[PDB]
C-alpha cells in the first residue's frame, strides 16, 4: 500500500484567552493519520500554561505518536502559528528527524511566551482564536 509520508495539520483553538488548563494540564488535538492505511496516528498536545514552574510563562507544544504498527517512526517536524493574515509566524523546527515510539512525544517546552501571545498588537489571536500549524515529514 501507498503511504502518506508528509502531512500538514492545522488546528484552531477557540476562545484561547479563556482556556482553563493549569500548569502541566494538556489540551489534546484530534487524532490525525498518516502512513499506510492510515496506520500512523498522531496528535498535538498544547500546555497553555507550560509543563512545570520553569515553563509556566510559556505555551508548550508537542507532537505525540498515538499509534503505530511496529516499533518506531522517524520524523522531522515544524510548528508555527498562523497569524491574522494566514501567514506562518513564530516557527520552530526539529533539528533533524527524531525517533518516535508509540506514546512518545517531541516538541518545545517553551514554544511561545504567553504574554506575547495574548497581546492583541501581535495579531496571533484574531477573534481570540489560536491557529497552530504542524508540518511533518516521516523519513522511516
Numbering used by the authors: 26 to 165
What did the paper state?
We also present, to our knowledge, the first X-ray structure of SPOP-MATH without bound substrate. F102, W131, and F133 are frequently mutated in prostate cancers, which results in reduced affinity of SPOP for substrate proteins. There is no evidence to suggest that global structural changes contribute substantially to the energetics of binding, as comparison between substrate-bound and substrate-unbound SPOP–MATH structures reveals only minor side chain conformational changes upon substrate binding.
Speckle-type POZ protein (SPOP) is a ubiquitin ligase adaptor that binds substrate proteins and facilitates their proteasomal degradation.
